[PDB]
Design a protein around this nucleic acid. Structure first.
Ligand code: MG
Ligand code: MG
Ligand code: MG
Ligand code: MG
Ligand code: MG
Ligand code: MG
Ligand code: MG
Ligand code: MG
Ligand code: MG
Ligand code: MG
Ligand code: MG
Ligand code: MG
Ligand code: MG
Ligand code: MG
Ligand code: MG
Ligand code: MG
Ligand code: MG
Ligand code: MG
Ligand code: MG
Ligand code: MG
Ligand code: MG
Ligand code: MG
Ligand code: MG
Ligand code: MG
Ligand code: MG
Ligand code: MG
Ligand code: MG
Ligand code: MG
Ligand code: MG
Ligand code: MG
Ligand code: MG
Ligand code: MG
Ligand code: MG
Ligand code: MG
Ligand code: MG
Ligand code: MG
Ligand code: MG
Ligand code: MG
Ligand code: MG
Ligand code: MG
Ligand code: MG
Ligand code: MG
Ligand code: MG
Ligand code: MG
Ligand code: MG
Ligand code: MG
Ligand code: MG
Ligand code: MG
Ligand code: MG
Ligand code: MG
Ligand code: MG
Ligand code: MG
Ligand code: MG
Ligand code: MG
Ligand code: MG
Ligand code: MG
Ligand code: MG
Ligand code: MG
Ligand code: MG
Ligand code: MG
Ligand code: MG
Ligand code: MG
Ligand code: MG
Ligand code: MG
Ligand code: MG
Ligand code: MG
Ligand code: MG
Ligand code: MG
Ligand code: MG
Ligand code: MG
Ligand code: MG
Ligand code: MG
Ligand code: MG
Ligand code: MG
Ligand code: MG
Ligand code: MG
Ligand code: MG
Ligand code: MG
Ligand code: MG
Ligand code: MG
Ligand code: MG
Ligand code: MG
Ligand code: MG
Ligand code: MG
Ligand code: MG
Ligand code: MG
Ligand code: MG
Ligand code: MG
Ligand code: MG
Ligand code: MG
Ligand code: MG
Ligand code: MG
Ligand code: MG
Ligand code: MG
Ligand code: MG
Lengths: 92, 62, 100, 88
RNA sequence: UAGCGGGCGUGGAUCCCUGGAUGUCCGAAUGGGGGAACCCGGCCGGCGGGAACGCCGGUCACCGCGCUUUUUGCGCGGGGGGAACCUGGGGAACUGAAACAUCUCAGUACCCAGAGGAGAGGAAAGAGAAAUCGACUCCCUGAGUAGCGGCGAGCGAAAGGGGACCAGCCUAAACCGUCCGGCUUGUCCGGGCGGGGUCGUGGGGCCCUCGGACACCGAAUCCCCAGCCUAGCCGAAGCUGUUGGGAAGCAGCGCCAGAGAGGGUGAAAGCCCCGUAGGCGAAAGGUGGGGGGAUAGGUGAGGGUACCCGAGUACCCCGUGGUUCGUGGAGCCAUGGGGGAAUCUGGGCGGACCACCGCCUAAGGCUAAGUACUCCGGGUGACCGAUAGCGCACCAGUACCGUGAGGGAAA
RNA sequence: GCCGACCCGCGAGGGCGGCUGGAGGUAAGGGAAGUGCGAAUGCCGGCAUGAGUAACGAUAAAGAGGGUGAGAAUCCCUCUCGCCGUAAGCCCAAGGGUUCCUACGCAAUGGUCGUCAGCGUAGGGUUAGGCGGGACCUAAGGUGAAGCCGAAAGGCGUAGCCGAA
RNA sequence: AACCCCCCGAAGCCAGGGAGCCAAGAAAAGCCUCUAAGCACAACCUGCGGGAACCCGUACCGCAAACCGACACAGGUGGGCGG
């Protein structure tokens, strides 16, 4: 149970913005600590994280026909990898 | 058919076994993640690879 | 379950309506609708196509599924009710008097 | 309230005022009302501890009789409420 | 639920029944908190470099009963929910009386606690007039009778008779053995366990005399089975013309029937399809004395003895409730206050009371069936057919409306 | 269902014909009822009248050139003009809950118009040891082991616990 | 780029300032101190070095067309700045 905190990378000009610097932001699992997003991405991309930042993404409400919706909630965490390091895995 | 084969071989995970029920699972999951990363970027996934994996793991998790 | 019936991928006569008489391989059976496909009702869809991909998609006079009841299965003597008979082990379907 | 050897709730029963002969007729004014257990505290010795006892005057005795029963009863080791539980 | 993108199935996929697994968070909600679905911990393990940080597995609420050396502990149980039914505690008013107060509405509405596939009640201290009946509950009847009643409005039994169902048991006390502790060491006193005992033609204890074991009776408990429930499966007999967009219509000649219920198929089908009659089926779970077996238990006659036979109880009086009974000649049952017995030369009842005669054995408990209901499944309708029928045939207890309880559509 | 100048009936009705409709209907003779509506300031729905009428929600106020666009008084730009300026500007808190930013778009919403929008579709967007709150404290108050009281439900209540601008 | 002089100047700051008055003006933790049990190889205290530091909010509106008023309603809405 570890490739479970990491969900998928966030893909957005703004996400990319910080690849250049040391900053990889991705969708984590909503109940994850920063203490865990850490030991997670650490044992997952074989880097050292010096800094995790998080924020919830209250899910917007879409709709269709009369049927009135509500998209699921989320939690970007954004990791600042030890100096110099990188994650080719993401740098496409 | 995918069942019979794997599951039999899966108690066959009994050299080391629960330890391996486990080890295997861990590896299985990294695959799922690698797989849904490929999934999200689009230009690297073809579907059921996903389902099939998740369920390996439900079985593995047994 | 239960949704099962008359035939399956095989050979069949159509005692229907438009194609009363015609005989053919049932290239299709969908039970959720209760409808088979032979080469009977095959009407014309003026339609370009639904999905933009593959620019052109066909006026194709494709095979319009049938009420699975208007077709009957068939052997040496053509078109028979089906009987079910048990071998020495299993279940094979003899016909109005023949077999298969 | 009620409990103890006693076992007697307060019951409610109506008090009906009448105006009359007996020897010409006899008439009224009825109306409900509560009717209580005469009920008193019974402090009492019993092993160590003073144990006490909300109970019906009518049954004060049964307590004393039940203090007796308990001479022939094994108890000490700090049990003030518990003693009472033990009685009967 | 089409589509985009991909897969799986006679190496029996989907799917249906059965058992298992997993089962975040909240909710009795139980480690603590809290503004339900959030927050914060202690302990023992584990994870990361891991002490600080975080996460993962386990565990920690409270109450009652039992066991345990006070205790710390250990086990068994409780908590919350449920359409209606049921039982106990509490309990109205409109209204009726053509005002109204007794009375009525009604022990209804409701609130509360509890019970459960039911619940209650239940083996006579009974009935009530026959030297009769013989637990309880339910239906018919008795009977709108007997009675109750500002004898107004109204209310309104029982016994008996016909039915359904059918079943009877355990104990307390004397008496004996025991173990424990209290002490004034006593042939005792008390508590616990065992035995013994369970009734009204009175019964039991104890003491004498006698034939009972191999007698037979036998569960409401337990064991096996049948049967049933939860998936299923088999199932008879038709083809050609013909009008038609379409036959199942019309026509011609056939056949089936333990099946001519019903549904569908391009319209109007026994023979096309699904069924129907008839008949078959369970590895697994549930049910199951209906059949069988076993165990717990149970069963004798006479004589003497006067030891025992359920206490703040009977009983009496005061205050009330129940009953057909509204204080009435007012018993019976129940009980808040006061006084307060006896153990069969005992007690209770038979409508004040007394005498006679007769009935029954209070003050401990348990007991199936017959009965009630309908959230649930099915079957049927001189039941509805979208302003009807459930509020809802439709994504409805929704939208919307209200702080909230709550109201509540349309389609 | 629509039409009829025909037929029968005292009448409520029935019949016949034509057109629509497109899958049910139900003699003679009987049976049973949710059985006949014009009114209930009736209930539900539809649609009228008033009437192209009153209004278009502060009398702070406009004008022009250019652009966009099928279409501009009404959108963008420019210049001129006017109004607020202890506000009609700016930052907190509450409540609100994606209304933020882009891109495409105008059926409806916008009291006119709309190319615009706070509107429709889609994608993005909210980063904290140090700000605020919690792993701190206590207030009224609440809860509440003990304890007290109450037919039941429950009431009061110590320690403690919860509770903050 | 310059970033300098002079003046006005708070109700804010120093803050637990001062004076007068009567109506006589929260608690608890932090913090400091005292010791008890217990420990004195601990443990507290100061410095330095290395390490560790979670959870929730954070958009936007906010005297209003985004809150309360069925409405882009002349109403209503606490605090700060307000040349
Ligand atoms: Mg929207
Ligand atoms: Mg046909
Ligand atoms: Mg005293
Ligand atoms: Mg007395
Ligand atoms: Mg398990
Ligand atoms: Mg839970
Ligand atoms: Mg909790
Ligand atoms: Mg912790
Ligand atoms: Mg740990
Ligand atoms: Mg190490
Ligand atoms: Mg425990
Ligand atoms: Mg011992
Ligand atoms: Mg319950
Ligand atoms: Mg009832
Ligand atoms: Mg009246
Ligand atoms: Mg009247
Ligand atoms: Mg009247
Ligand atoms: Mg009651
Ligand atoms: Mg129950
Ligand atoms: Mg029954
Ligand atoms: Mg019962
Ligand atoms: Mg009972
Ligand atoms: Mg008896
Ligand atoms: Mg009785
Ligand atoms: Mg007799
Ligand atoms: Mg009168
Ligand atoms: Mg009455
Ligand atoms: Mg019967
Ligand atoms: Mg019956
Ligand atoms: Mg015994
Ligand atoms: Mg004795
Ligand atoms: Mg003895
Ligand atoms: Mg001995
Ligand atoms: Mg015995
Ligand atoms: Mg023997
Ligand atoms: Mg037997
Ligand atoms: Mg013939
Ligand atoms: Mg038919
Ligand atoms: Mg079978
Ligand atoms: Mg069978
Ligand atoms: Mg039976
Ligand atoms: Mg036997
Ligand atoms: Mg025996
Ligand atoms: Mg004798
Ligand atoms: Mg008395
Ligand atoms: Mg008497
Ligand atoms: Mg009375
Ligand atoms: Mg009376
Ligand atoms: Mg009277
Ligand atoms: Mg008498
Ligand atoms: Mg009494
Ligand atoms: Mg008499
Ligand atoms: Mg006599
Ligand atoms: Mg039903
Ligand atoms: Mg039903
Ligand atoms: Mg309706
Ligand atoms: Mg309608
Ligand atoms: Mg329904
Ligand atoms: Mg509202
Ligand atoms: Mg017609
Ligand atoms: Mg008919
Ligand atoms: Mg009839
Ligand atoms: Mg009517
Ligand atoms: Mg009507
Ligand atoms: Mg009318
Ligand atoms: Mg009017
Ligand atoms: Mg008009
Ligand atoms: Mg005018
Ligand atoms: Mg005008
Ligand atoms: Mg104006
Ligand atoms: Mg002016
Ligand atoms: Mg202009
Ligand atoms: Mg241009
Ligand atoms: Mg242009
Ligand atoms: Mg142009
Ligand atoms: Mg001002
Ligand atoms: Mg929106
Ligand atoms: Mg902004
Ligand atoms: Mg528009
Ligand atoms: Mg407009
Ligand atoms: Mg408007
Ligand atoms: Mg434009
Ligand atoms: Mg345009
Ligand atoms: Mg434009
Ligand atoms: Mg910093
Ligand atoms: Mg924490
Ligand atoms: Mg007290
Ligand atoms: Mg506190
Ligand atoms: Mg340091
Ligand atoms: Mg911000
Ligand atoms: Mg305003
Ligand atoms: Mg509003
Ligand atoms: Mg406006
Ligand atoms: Mg103001
Ligand atoms: Mg100023």
């Amino acid at each position: 149970t570890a490739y479970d905190v990491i969900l998928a990378p966030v893909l957005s000009e703004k996400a990319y913005a910080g690849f250049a610097e040391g900053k990889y932001t991705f969708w984590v699992h909503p109940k994850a600590t920063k203490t865990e997003i850490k030991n997670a991405v650490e044992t997952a991309f074989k880097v050292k994280v010096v800094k995790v930042n998080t924020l919830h993404v209250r899910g917007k409400k879409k709709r269709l026909g009369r049927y009135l919706g509500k998209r699921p909630d989320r939690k970007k965490a954004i990791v600042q990898v030890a100096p110099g390091q990188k994650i080719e895995a993401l740098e496409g | 058919m995918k069942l019979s084969e794997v599951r039999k071989q899966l108690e066959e995970a009994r050299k080391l076994s629960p330890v391996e029920l486990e080890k295997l699972v861990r590896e299985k999951k990294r695959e799922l993640m690698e797989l849904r990363f490929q999934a999200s970027i689009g230009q690297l996934s073809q579907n059921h690879k996903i389902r099939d994996l998740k369920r390996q793991i439900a079985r593995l998790l047994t | 379950r239960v949704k099962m019936h008359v035939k399956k991928g095989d050979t069949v006569l159509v005692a229907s309506g438009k194609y009363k008489g015609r005989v053919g391989k049932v290239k299709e059976v969908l039970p959720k609708k209760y409808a088979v496909i032979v080469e009977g009702v095959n009407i014309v869809k003026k339609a370009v196509r639904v999905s933009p991909k593959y620019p052109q998609g066909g006026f194709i006079e494709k095979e319009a599924p049938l009420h699975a009841s208007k077709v009957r299965p068939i052997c040496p003597a053509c078109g028979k009710p089906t009987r079910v008979r048990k071998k020495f082990l299993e279940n094979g379907k003899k016909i109005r008097v023949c077999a298969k | 309230s009620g409990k103890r050897p006693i076992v007697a709730n307060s019951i409610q029963r109506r008090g009906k005022a009448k105006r009359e002969g007996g020897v010409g007729k006899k008439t009224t004014g009825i109306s409900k009302r509560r009717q209580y257990p005469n009920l008193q505290k019974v402090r009492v010795r019993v092993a160590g501890q003073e144990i006490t006892f909300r109970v019906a005057a009518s049954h004060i005795p049964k307590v004393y009789e039940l203090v007796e029963r308990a001479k022939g009863l094994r108890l000490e080791g700090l049990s003030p409420k518990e003693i009472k539980k033990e009685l009967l």
